[PDB]
């Protein structure tokens, strides 16, 4: 059973370099070419090149000649890809893929995410969204927490320690021009609950060991 | 007077199943033909294609790089082939053989040094080193062996489009003890390919000028030994060997070469052409249709006819189809017994006061041996 | 008719060398005609088969010849970032030999050539090569028109357009009377085939020893094609030169493509610019129509005729359904723009697998009766299968359908007696043109002399 | 290289309907065209190899077809597990290329965006930046065009438009666009309307929502 095991997510900085591995197990390592594919988030898949672990011969896609560099270590049966002169176009998920006896790429690594933001690990500054009490003679009540200027992903937002599992819309983080992420997490709630039960968002940032629980309450009530 | 005395006349059989080697598909089986100088005597032959006659299906597969998808479709062929060929025969033996092309430049990728053990080096994949013809499975009735052997087959890769398929046909035909061709059986050589084929004098592009001698060169390694030192066969030599070994060649070829292999099958008696899919997915029905189509035609052939003797045939096909000048009867089915009114004419009185020739249908060992005596 | 099969002059070469595979006549500056013999399996300097050429002076006894020396060392050159390397192992030097006025063109069709620049390369492949030699002056040259420095991935990008990597230039060769060396390269353009023409003087002047990849200025190559009728046609398997358009100031090339249009076979007439004037199509699939081509005036009307060999042609018989006997097609040139239509005569073999039409030698006026004659070889013909050469005399209406003489192989079986033929030249200078037959399986060359 | 052009770029199909995804190669890649599925719970999964050969363990609703330059991937009854991205891939010539991709959406009935407006809280107002959030909740299709109207003027730039993935039970989207500006640009103006302009909205189509800065 051919299994491809890659390294984990690796944050990087522009102009720097990142080296990701792919432990190949389930087949004779030096015989077969190892192929690398790049997929930018939300875009299609782009072939990078292949590496022959036998003679460490490599052939890239002209788009990646010089940028990506493939090396193999047949002692541990690992292939290493090193991206040089990183830009923001290099922030993608890189897969090592292998073909089977039918020459289709049926075996893929789980993917190595690369991030080239160049921003120090900052904690989230959660801000309440203050559901307007004026928007009462109408639809339901919408309240949320504005988690702004944190790094890196992700931020685990849970409302009232997981009590609010319905109407929770944690939006995907948006990379700002400052290099940090700012996601929002809104909750739709019955307007009759505005004042009865207070809702608290449990913003949990795994890096920086930040766990902040902000209280949301209407304004001019 | 000139007479045609019948020596061996066994009646035609009804079923080819059971105790074989007693299944007579031609009657009579021997005739004594006394001919005074410059005379002519007529005799008749009946050729029935019996039912449930044992079949040998040697699957000769192009294993070039374009056929890596086809190995996914052949992986259960042999069990499906045994199920579909079970209504057509009670004794089925199937074998497998593979060809790519002569493993020599400019057909074989010769550089980099890694492209000799892996011709798919520039495709960034891995295939087998290039072979010309390898025998894989001797014709066996254990049809699961076909699956076991095709699951462990891999393709190779060569440079040019024509393949070394006729080399493989010659070797699968003349290495009859290595292939496993039974004597009392139908010999279906299923030749699958998706490309043009190399013919004689093509090997000169590799430096190979020695003509194909038509001898067996598959050794114990099960590989064609003379692939790199002997030229490709011509249609003449390959047709002669297919006729000598009673082999019905089946061109299972893709639509891009269907016309080429039909124009070839016009020049090779006993051959049919089926349209193969780009992944060999219709090869079971192709083999079944081509077996029904090969047995839908009785074509006579004369072996070792003396020069002083000429023959004229009046094919008595379907009840009222007396077709003069024809030594063939198309549009038949398994079980139909056709007749041929043959007439042997002498041109003088040769020195040999007794000669002998044989008249047999194409693809069968059963023959009419005409012992011709010139008095 | 008057070739003497008794007094035979046998020239011999090294054993296993395929001596006699190709042969021409060489007229010295003094006019003494020698025999150029190619032996593509002669052992080189390291006991590797590299091929060789033997310049056999005419002696009525025959025997062994002195080899004509060429550079047989694999060369390697770094020109910029590229390593250029030629491979002489099994290059087949002498697989075709043609002799112009004082130049002997010896071609090595299966000479390999690679270009290493980086981890990438140009796919070592038989580009071919022709070795030019002035044996009386000692001057040597070379002409490899299909060497390049383009890398494999560039050809994969272009969909293998203008891919001269497998040319095998010098597979067939011919020198026009003006002095242009026309090379057949049946593997050129990814086995479509091409012609390479360059003047011999411009090859000798443009050749620098040590330089591996150069370009003759006056060199002219054929054109690639996307027409699938030309795929794997092996255009350039055989080449000839004649006069087939009336204008006697230009030379017409006669190129055989024996697998043209799905192994049907063709022979195309062209001009010096490779524009197809006429195309003769094969009569039968896989008959190798265009394996050999000869250009002679067999009916004495001044207009060159075309003889095409189809050595694998199958005729109709009774004990054999289709009998591979071989066939030669005669195309008489009529007074007209092209007018070259159906073959005016069909010469067919009689021996099964005799390969009748593998060689067709214009013998010149063998019996000096006004009409040029023709020798067709069945290298495996005759009732014994050892090889025949059949002499067909020209007449007022083409050739004679019956051979005026058959030359049976004086060598054992497998000699391929007749695989190479050469006539029209008078070695012993008795006024009648002689015939030089090459049996490369016997590693010998038989010299038949025409009697008065 | 061999360019594989997929059509359509996106495709909305009701769960249970039939789909036909197309791929068109720059040149002949006979059947060397494979189909990958990627709904982001794993690496790209190969569904159909060599343009008609279903892989082992692939549901029988996926069918491949096509040869030469035109290839098709047919799904009989798209399940909720089939909605994702589908890439055709050629292994005919190196370099091996993929298609642009084809997303499969769920295609429920059009819904109206439940628009909202959030003023910057006092906590964020302490810092020198203020972001107003305009929330479009549970709408379909995703093709909305939100514009910020500051003092009845178009506001180019300073927008995020973070759209959520298509919901699970009721397959609607949800959008949140934020206007990032300093406290100077915040207290400088007084009108912060949010134009929506979604097709799911009746007349007036432009549902410009306001909060009444007080
Ligand atoms: Ca295929
Ligand atoms: Ca080939
Ligand atoms: Ca002219
Ligand atoms: Ca003439
Ligand atoms: Ca004459
Ligand atoms: Ca003479
Ligand atoms: Mg092929």
CA-to-CA distance for C281 and B83, rounded, in angstroms? 47
**CA distance, residue D37 to nearest chain C CA (Å):** 28
Do B205 and C156 count as a contact with CB atoms less than 8 A apart? no
Residue C156 is inside which H or E element, if any?
helix C152-157
- HSE toward the beta carbon, residue C352, CA cutoff 13 A: 15
Confirm whether residue C28 is marked as ligand binding. no
The strand pairing partners of A79, in sequence order, are: A22, A72
Domain boundary pick from A115, A143, A174: A115
Which residues numbered 143-162 in B keep a CB inside 8 Å of some CB on A? 154
Cβ-count burial of C194 within 10 angstroms (0-12 exposed, 13-18 middle, 19+ buried)?
A: buried
- The CATH architecture annotation of domain D4-105 reads Sandwich (2.60)
- CA distances for B361 relative to B249, B251, B314, C124, C265, angstroms: 15, 20, 14, 50, 32
Which other chains touch chain B, taking contact as 3+ CB pairs less than 8 Å apart?
Answer: A, C, D
Confirm whether residue C297 is marked as ligand binding. yes
Alpha-carbon radius of gyration of chain A: 23
Query: Which residue in chain D has the smallest CA separation from B256?
Result: D30
CB A81 within 8 A of CB A19: yes
Q: Is D188 on the interface with C (CB under 8 A)?
A: no
CA dihedral of residues D204, D208, D209, D211 (deg, nearest 10):
-130
CB D45 within 8 A of CB D37: yes
> Phi and psi (nearest 5°) for D115?
-75, 145
Residues B43 and B54 in one domain: no
| Interface residues of chain C, partner chain A, Cβ below 8 Å | 119-120, 153
**CA distance, residue D31 to nearest chain B CA (Å):** 7
Query: Which residue in chain B has the smallest CA separation from C153?
Result: B122
Residues of A whose CB is below 8 A from B64: none
* Domain membership flag for residue A15: yes
| First and final C-alpha spacing in chain D | 61
Number of domains, chain B: 2
CA-to-CA distance for B187 and B166, rounded, in angstroms? 17
| First and final C-alpha spacing in chain B | 9
- HSE toward the beta carbon, residue C429, CA cutoff 13 A: 7
CB B242 within 8 A of CB B140: no
Structure determined via:
cryo-EM
CB C310 within 8 A of CB C291: yes
Cis peptide preceding C238, ω within 30 of 0: no
Hey, CA dihedral for C419, C423, C429, C431, is it positive or negative?
positive
Domain boundary pick from B298, B316, B343: B298
CB C418 within 8 A of CB C408: no
CA-to-CA distance for C450 and C436, rounded, in angstroms? 11
Please name the member of A57, A59, A103 whose beta carbon is closest to the beta carbon of B125. A103
Find the ligand nearest to B70 CA.
1
CA-to-CA distance for B4 and B31, rounded, in angstroms? 7
Closest residue by Cα to residue B332 from B51, B2, B7: B51
**Distance from chain centroid for Cα B31:** 27
Q: Is D98 on the interface with B (CB under 8 A)?
A: no
Residue B43 is inside which H or E element, if any?
strand B40-48
Name the residue range of residue B195's domain. 50-298
Q: Is B66 on the interface with A (CB under 8 A)?
A: no
CB D51 within 8 A of CB D59: no
Cis peptide preceding D23, ω within 30 of 0: no
Specify the DSSP class assigned to residue C264: T
Burial C81-112 (b: 16+ CB within 10 A, else e): ebbbbbbbebbbbbbbbbbbebbbbbbbbbbb
CA-to-CA distance for C319 and C121, rounded, in angstroms? 54
Hey, CA dihedral for C198, C200, C206, C207, is it positive or negative?
positive
* Domain membership flag for residue A203: yes
Q: Residue for token digits 């959008």?
A: D175
CA-to-CA distance for C253 and C273, rounded, in angstroms? 9
CB A78 within 8 A of CB A56: no
CA-to-CA distance for C439 and C421, rounded, in angstroms? 9
* Domain membership flag for residue A120: no
Give the length of chain D.
Answer: 214
Residues A85 and A133 in one domain: no
- HSE toward the beta carbon, residue D18, CA cutoff 13 A: 5
Residues A133 and A100 in one domain: no
Residues B77 and B8 in one domain: no
Residue B8 is inside which H or E element, if any?
strand B4-8
Residue among C152, C155, C156, C226 with most chain D CBs within 10 A, to mutate: C156
Structure tokens at C291: 């394996």
CA-to-CA distance for A141 and A6, rounded, in angstroms? 45
- CA distances for C383 relative to B215, C349, C357, C445, angstroms: 21, 11, 17, 21
CB C277 within 8 A of CB C338: yes
Do D94 and C157 count as a contact with CB atoms less than 8 A apart? no
Roughly what angle, to the nearest 10 degrees, separates helices B165-174 and B235-244?
30
Q: Gaps after which residues in chain C, C–N over 2.5 Å?
A: none
Cβ-count burial of A166 within 10 angstroms (0-12 exposed, 13-18 middle, 19+ buried)?
A: exposed
Do C191 and B110 count as a contact with CB atoms less than 8 A apart? no
- CA distances for D108 relative to A152, C107, D14, D111, angstroms: 35, 75, 7, 9
Do C156 and D27 count as a contact with CB atoms less than 8 A apart? no
SS3 labels along chain A:
CCEEEECCCEECCCCCCEEEEEEEECCCCCCCCEEEEEECCCCCEEEEEEEECCCCEEEECHHHECCEEEEEECCCCEEEEEECCCCHHHCCEEEEEECCCCCCCCEECCCEEEECCCCCCECCEEEECCCCCCCCCCCCEEEEEEEEEEECCCEEEEEHHHCCCCCEEECCCEECCCCCEEEEEEEEECHHHCCCCCEEEEEEECHHHEEEEEEECCCCC
Confirm whether residue C263 is marked as ligand binding. no
CA-to-CA distance for D31 and D92, rounded, in angstroms? 8
Do A127 and D121 count as a contact with CB atoms less than 8 A apart? yes
Residues A105 and A129 in one domain: no
Structure tokens at C352: 């099964």
CATH assignment at residue B170: 3.40.50.410
CB B345 within 8 A of CB B8: no
Q: What angle do CA D73, D76, D80 make, to 5 degrees?
A: 95
Specify the DSSP class assigned to residue B130: P
Residue C269 is inside which H or E element, if any?
strand C266-270
CA-to-CA distance for B159 and A102, rounded, in angstroms? 20
CA-to-CA distance for D174 and A130, rounded, in angstroms? 19
CB D173 within 8 A of CB D79: no
CA-to-CA distance for B346 and B294, rounded, in angstroms? 33
**CA distance, residue A61 to nearest chain D CA (Å):** 7
| First and final C-alpha spacing in chain C | 10
- Beta carbon pairs, A and C, within 8 Å: 5
Closest residue by Cα to residue B271 from B283, B263, B282, B280: B263
| C272 Cα: distance to centroid of ligand 3 (angstroms) | 9
CA-to-CA distance for A70 and A57, rounded, in angstroms? 9
* Domain membership flag for residue A37: yes
Cβ-count burial of B6 within 10 angstroms (0-12 exposed, 13-18 middle, 19+ buried)?
A: middle
SS3 B147: helix
**CA distance, residue A57 to nearest chain C CA (Å):** 7
CA-to-CA distance for A97 and D98, rounded, in angstroms? 13
Residues B150 and B253 in one domain: yes
The DSSP result for C160-223, as a single string, is STT--TT--BTSEEEE-TTSEEEEEETTHHHHTBEEEEEEHHHHHHH--TT--S---TT-EE--
The DSSP result for C238-261, as a single string, is EEEEE--SS-TTS-EEEEEETTHH
The strand pairing partners of A168, in sequence order, are: A187
CA-to-CA distance for B242 and B197, rounded, in angstroms? 17
CB A36 within 8 A of CB A72: no
Cis peptide preceding B288, ω within 30 of 0: no
Residues B281 and B314 in one domain: no
In chain C, where the domains are located: 1-452
CATH assignment at residue A58: 2.60.40.10
> Phi and psi (nearest 5°) for C191?
70, 15
- CA distances for A4 relative to A34, B367, C278, D97, D141, angstroms: 10, 63, 61, 21, 38
CA-to-CA distance for D62 and D75, rounded, in angstroms? 5
Closest residue by Cα to residue B106 from A106, C336, C123: C123
CA-to-CA distance for C265 and C259, rounded, in angstroms? 5
Cβ-count burial of D109 within 10 angstroms (0-12 exposed, 13-18 middle, 19+ buried)?
A: exposed
Residues A8 and A109 in one domain: yes
Q: Is A108 on the interface with B (CB under 8 A)?
A: no
**Distance from chain centroid for Cα B317:** 24
Residue among A40, A42, A45, A46 with most chain D CBs within 10 A, to mutate: A45
Hey, CA dihedral for A136, A142, A144, A148, is it positive or negative?
negative
Domain boundary pick from B278, B298, B318: B298
Q: Residue for token digits 């420095």?
A: C149
Resolution of this model in Å is 2.8
CATH assignment at residue B321: 2.60.40.1510
* Domain membership flag for residue A221: no
> Phi and psi (nearest 5°) for C208?
-115, 125
Q: B170 CB contacts (<8 Å, ≥6 apart)?
A: B212, B214, B233, B237, B238, B241
Residues of C whose CB is below 8 A from A57: 119
Q: D149 CB contacts (<8 Å, ≥6 apart)?
A: D155, D191, D192, D193, D194, D195, D208
The DSSP result for chain D, as a single string, is ---EEEE-SEEE--TTS-EEEEEEESS--TT-EEEEEE-TTSS-EEEEETTTEEPTT--TTEEEEEETTEEEEEESS--TTS-SEEEEEE-SSSSPEEB--EEEE-----B--EEEEEPPPHHHHHTTEEEEEEEEEEEBSS----EEEESSSB--S----EEPPPPSSS--EEEEEEEEEEHHHHHH---EEEE---TTS-SS----B-----
β-strand pairing of C96-99 with C82-87: unpaired
CA-to-CA distance for B365 and B279, rounded, in angstroms? 34
The strand pairing partners of A186, in sequence order, are: A144, A169
What are the helix (H) ranges across chain B? 70-73, 79-84, 144-151, 165-174, 176-179, 235-244, 258-265, 283-294
**CA distance, residue B251 to nearest chain A CA (Å):** 24
SS3 B64: coil
Q: What angle do CA C153, C159, C164 make, to 5 degrees?
A: 75
| B112 Cα: distance to centroid of ligand 2 (angstroms) | 18
CA-to-CA distance for D197 and D149, rounded, in angstroms? 13
The strand pairing partners of C362, in sequence order, are: C374
Q: Residue for token digits 């070792």?
A: B304
Domain boundary pick from B255, B278, B298: B298
Confirm whether residue C102 is marked as ligand binding. no
Q: Is C189 on the interface with B (CB under 8 A)?
A: no
**Distance from chain centroid for Cα A149:** 16
The DSSP result for C85-110, as a single string, is EEE-TT--BTSEEEE-SS-EEEE-TT
| First and final C-alpha spacing in chain A | 63
Name the residue range of residue A93's domain. 3-115
**Distance from chain centroid for Cα C65:** 22
CA-to-CA distance for D179 and D147, rounded, in angstroms? 10
Specify the DSSP class assigned to residue B91: -
Residues A106 and A164 in one domain: no
Residues A97 and A131 in one domain: no
Closest residue by Cα to residue B208 from C440, C188, C382: C440
Number of domains, chain A: 2
* Domain membership flag for residue A102: yes
Closest residue by Cα to residue C187 from B106, B210, B196, B203: B106
Residues of D whose CB is below 8 A from B279: 31, 50, 52-53
Q: A62 CB contacts (<8 Å, ≥6 apart)?
A: none
The strand pairing partners of C128, in sequence order, are: C169
Specify the DSSP class assigned to residue B214: -
Q: Residue for token digits 């766990």?
A: A211
**CA distance, residue D197 to nearest chain C CA (Å):** 47
Q: Is B279 on the interface with D (CB under 8 A)?
A: yes
Do D30 and B281 count as a contact with CB atoms less than 8 A apart? no
Residue among B101, B105, B231, B313 with most chain C CBs within 10 A, to mutate: B105
C1-452 is classed CATH 3.40.50.300: no
Burial B297-336 (b: 16+ CB within 10 A, else e): bbbbbbeebbebbebebbbbbeeeeebeebbbbeebebeb
Confirm whether residue C367 is marked as ligand binding. yes
Which residues numbered 11-50 in D keep a CB inside 8 Å of some CB on C? 27
Structure tokens at B129: 């080193």
Hey, CA dihedral for A37, A38, A44, A46, is it positive or negative?
negative
CA-to-CA distance for C418 and C424, rounded, in angstroms? 16
CA-to-CA distance for C369 and B193, rounded, in angstroms? 54
CA-to-CA distance for C98 and C176, rounded, in angstroms? 10
CA-to-CA distance for C151 and C335, rounded, in angstroms? 49
- CA distances for D71 relative to A147, B361, C232, C447, D39, angstroms: 45, 46, 29, 64, 21
Do D30 and B66 count as a contact with CB atoms less than 8 A apart? yes
Residue among D91, D92, D97 with most chain B CBs within 10 A, to mutate: D91
Cβ-count burial of C1 within 10 angstroms (0-12 exposed, 13-18 middle, 19+ buried)?
A: middle
Which residues numbered 171-210 in A keep a CB inside 8 Å of some CB on D? 171-174, 176, 182-184, 186, 188
Specify the DSSP class assigned to residue B145: H
CB B98 within 8 A of CB B134: yes
Give the length of chain C.
Answer: 452
Q: A78 CB contacts (<8 Å, ≥6 apart)?
A: A21, A22, A23, A24, A72
Residue C152 is inside which H or E element, if any?
helix C152-157
């Amino acid at each position: 059973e051919v299994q491809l095991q890659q390294s984990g997510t690796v944050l990087a900085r522009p102009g720097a370099s990142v080296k990701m591995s792919c432990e190949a197990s389930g087949y004779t390592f030096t015989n077969y070419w190892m192929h690398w594919v790049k997929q930018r988030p939300g875009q299609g898949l782009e072939w990078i090149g292949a590496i022959y672990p036998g003679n460490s011969d490599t052939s890239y896609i002209q788009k990646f000649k010089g940028k990506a560099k493939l090396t193999a270590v047949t002692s541990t049966t690992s292939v290493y890809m090193e991206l040089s002169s990183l830009t923001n176009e290099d922030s993608a998920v890189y897969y090592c893929t292998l073909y089977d006896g039918y020459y289709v790429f049926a075996y893929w690594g789980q993917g190595t995410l690369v991030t080239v933001s160049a921003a120090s690990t900052k904690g989230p500054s959660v801000f309440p969204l203050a559901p307007s009490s004026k928007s009462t003679s109408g639809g339901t009540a919408a309240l949320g927490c504005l988690v702004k200027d944190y790094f890196p992903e992700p931020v685990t937002v849970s409302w009232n320690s997981g009590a609010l599992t319905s109407g929770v819309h944690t939006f995907p983080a948006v990379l700002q021009s400052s290099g940090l992420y700012s996601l929002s997490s809104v909750v739709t709630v019955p307007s009759s609950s505005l004042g009865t039960q207070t809702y608290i968002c449990n913003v949990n940032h795994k890096p920086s060991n930040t766990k902040v629980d902000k209280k949301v309450e209407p304004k001019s009530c | 007077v000139s007479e045609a005395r019948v020596l061996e006349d066994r009646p035609l059989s009804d079923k080819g199943s059971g105790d074989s080697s007693q299944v007579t598909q031609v009657s009579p089986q021997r005739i004594a033909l006394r001919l005074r100088p410059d005379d002519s005597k007529n005799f008749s032959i009946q050729v029935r294609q019996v039912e449930d006659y044992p079949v040998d299906i040697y699957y000769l597969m192009d294993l070039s790089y374009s056929m890596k998808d086809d190995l996914w479709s052949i992986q259960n062929l042999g069990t499906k082939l045994a199920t579909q060929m079970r209504k057509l025969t009670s004794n089925l033996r199937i074998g497998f053989g593979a060809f790519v092309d002569k493993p020599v430049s400019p057909y074989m990728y010769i550089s980099p040094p890694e492209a000799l053990e892996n011709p798919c080096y520039d495709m960034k994949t891995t295939c087998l080193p290039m072979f010309g013809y390898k025998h894989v499975l001797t014709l066996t009735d254990q049809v699961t062996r076909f699956n076991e052997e095709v699951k462990k087959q891999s393709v190779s890769r060569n440079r040019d489009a024509p393949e070394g398929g006729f080399d493989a046909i010659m070797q699968a035909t003349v290495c009859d003890e290595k292939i496993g061709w039974r004597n009392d059986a139908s010999h279906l050589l299923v030749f699958t390919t998706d490309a043009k084929t190399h013919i004689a004098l093509d090997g000169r592009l590799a430096g190979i000028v020695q003509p194909n001698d038509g001898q067996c060169h598959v050794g114990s390694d099960n590989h064609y030994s003379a692939s790199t030192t002997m030229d490709y066969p011509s249609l003449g030599l390959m047709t002669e060997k297919l006729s000598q070994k009673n082999i019905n060649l089946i061109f299972a070829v893709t639509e891009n070469v269907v016309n080429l292999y039909q124009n070839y099958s016009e020049l090779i008696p006993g051959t049919t052409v089926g349209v193969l899919s780009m992944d060999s997915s219709n090869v079971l029905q192709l083999i079944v249709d081509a077996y029904g189509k090969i047995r839908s035609k009785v074509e006579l052939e004369v072996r070792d006819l003396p020069e002083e003797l000429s023959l004229s045939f009046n094919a008595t096909c379907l009840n009222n189809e007396v077709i003069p000048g024809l030594k063939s009867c198309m549009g038949l089915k398994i079980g139909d017994t056709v007749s041929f009114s043959i007439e042997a004419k002498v041109r003088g009185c040769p020195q040999e006061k007794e000669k002998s020739f044989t008249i047999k249908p194409v693809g069968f060992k059963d023959s009419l041996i005409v012992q011709v005596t010139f008095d | 008719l008057n070739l003497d099969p008794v007094q035979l002059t046998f020239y011999a070469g090294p054993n296993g060398s395929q001596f006699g595979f190709s042969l021409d006549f060489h007229k010295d500056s003094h006019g003494r005609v020698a025999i150029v013999v190619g032996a593509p399996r002669t052992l080189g300097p390291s006991q590797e088969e590299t091929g060789g050429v033997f310049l056999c002076p005419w002696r009525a006894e025959g025997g062994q010849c002195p080899s004509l020396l060429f550079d047989l060392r694999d060369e390697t050159r770094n020109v910029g970032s590229q390593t250029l390397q030629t491979f002489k192992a099994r290059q087949g030097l002498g697989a075709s030999v043609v002799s112009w006025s004082d130049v002997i063109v010896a071609c090595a069709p299966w000479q390999h050539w690679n270009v290493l620049e980086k981890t990438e390369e140009a796919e070592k492949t038989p580009v071919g090569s022709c070795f030019l030699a002035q044996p009386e002056s000692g001057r040597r040259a070379e002409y490899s028109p299909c060497r390049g420095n383009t890398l494999s991935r560039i050809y994969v990008e272009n969909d293998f357009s203008w891919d001269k990597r497998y040319c095998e230039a010098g597979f067939s060769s011919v020198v026009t009377q003006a002095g242009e060396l026309v090379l057949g390269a049946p593997g050129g353009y990814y086995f479509l085939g091409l012609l390479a023409q360059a003047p011999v003087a411009d090859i000798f002047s443009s050749y620098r020893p040590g330089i591996l990849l150069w370009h003759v200025s006056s060199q002219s190559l054929s054109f690639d094609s996307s027409n699938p009728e030309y795929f794997d046609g092996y255009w350039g398997y055989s080449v000839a030169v004649g006069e087939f358009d009336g204008d006697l100031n230009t030379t017409e090339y006669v190129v055989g493509a024996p697998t043209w249009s799905w192994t049907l076979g063709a022979v195309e007439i062209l001009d010096s610019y490779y524009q197809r004037l006429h195309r003769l199509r094969g009569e039968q699939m896989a008959s190798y129509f265009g394996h050999s081509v000869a250009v002679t005036d067999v009916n004495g009307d001044g207009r060159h005729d075309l003889l095409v060999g189809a050595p694998l042609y199958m005729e109709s018989r009774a004990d054999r359904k289709l009998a591979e006997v071989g066939r030669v097609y005669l195309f008489l040139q009529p007074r007209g723009p092209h007018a070259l239509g159906a073959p005016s005569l069909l010469l067919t073999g009689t021996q099964l697998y005799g390969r009748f039409g593998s060689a067709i030698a214009p013998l010149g006026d063998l019996d000096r009766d006004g009409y040029n004659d023709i020798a067709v070889a069945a290298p495996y013909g005759g009732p014994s299968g050892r090889g025949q050469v059949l002499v067909f005399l020209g007449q007022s209406e083409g050739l004679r359908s019956r051979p005026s003489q058959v030359l049976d192989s004086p060598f054992p079986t497998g000699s391929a007696f007749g695989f190479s033929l050469r006539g029209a030249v008078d070695i012993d200078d008795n006024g009648y043109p002689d015939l030089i037959v090459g049996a490369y399986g016997a590693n010998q060359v038989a010299v038949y002399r025409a009697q008065p | 290289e061999i360019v594989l052009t997929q059509s359509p770029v996106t495709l909305s199909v009701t769960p249970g309907d039939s789909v036909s995804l197309s791929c068109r190669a720059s040149r002949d890649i006979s059947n060397n065209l494979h189909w990958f599925q990627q709904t982001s719970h794993e690496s790209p999964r190969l569904l159909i190899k060599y343009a008609s050969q279903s892989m082992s363990g692939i549901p029988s609703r996926f069918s491949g077809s096509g040869s030469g330059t035109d290839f098709t991937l047919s799904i009989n009854s798209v399940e909720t597990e089939d909605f994702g991205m589908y890439f055709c891939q050629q292994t005919n010539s190196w370099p091996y290329t993929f298609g642009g991709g084809t997303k499969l959406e769920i295609k429920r009935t059009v819904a109206a965006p439940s628009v909202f407006i959030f003023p910057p809280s006092d906590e964020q107002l302490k810092s020198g930046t203020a972001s107003v959030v305009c929330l479009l909740n549970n709408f379909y299709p995703r093709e909305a065009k939100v514009q910020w109207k500051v003092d009845n003027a178009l506001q180019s730039g300073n927008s995020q438009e973070s759209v959520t993935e298509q919901d699970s039970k009721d397959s609607t989207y949800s959008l949140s666009s934020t206007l990032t500006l300093s406290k100077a640009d915040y207290e400088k103006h007084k009108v912060y309307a949010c134009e929506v302009t979604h097709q799911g909205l009746s007349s007036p189509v432009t549902k410009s929502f306001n909060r009444g800065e007080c």
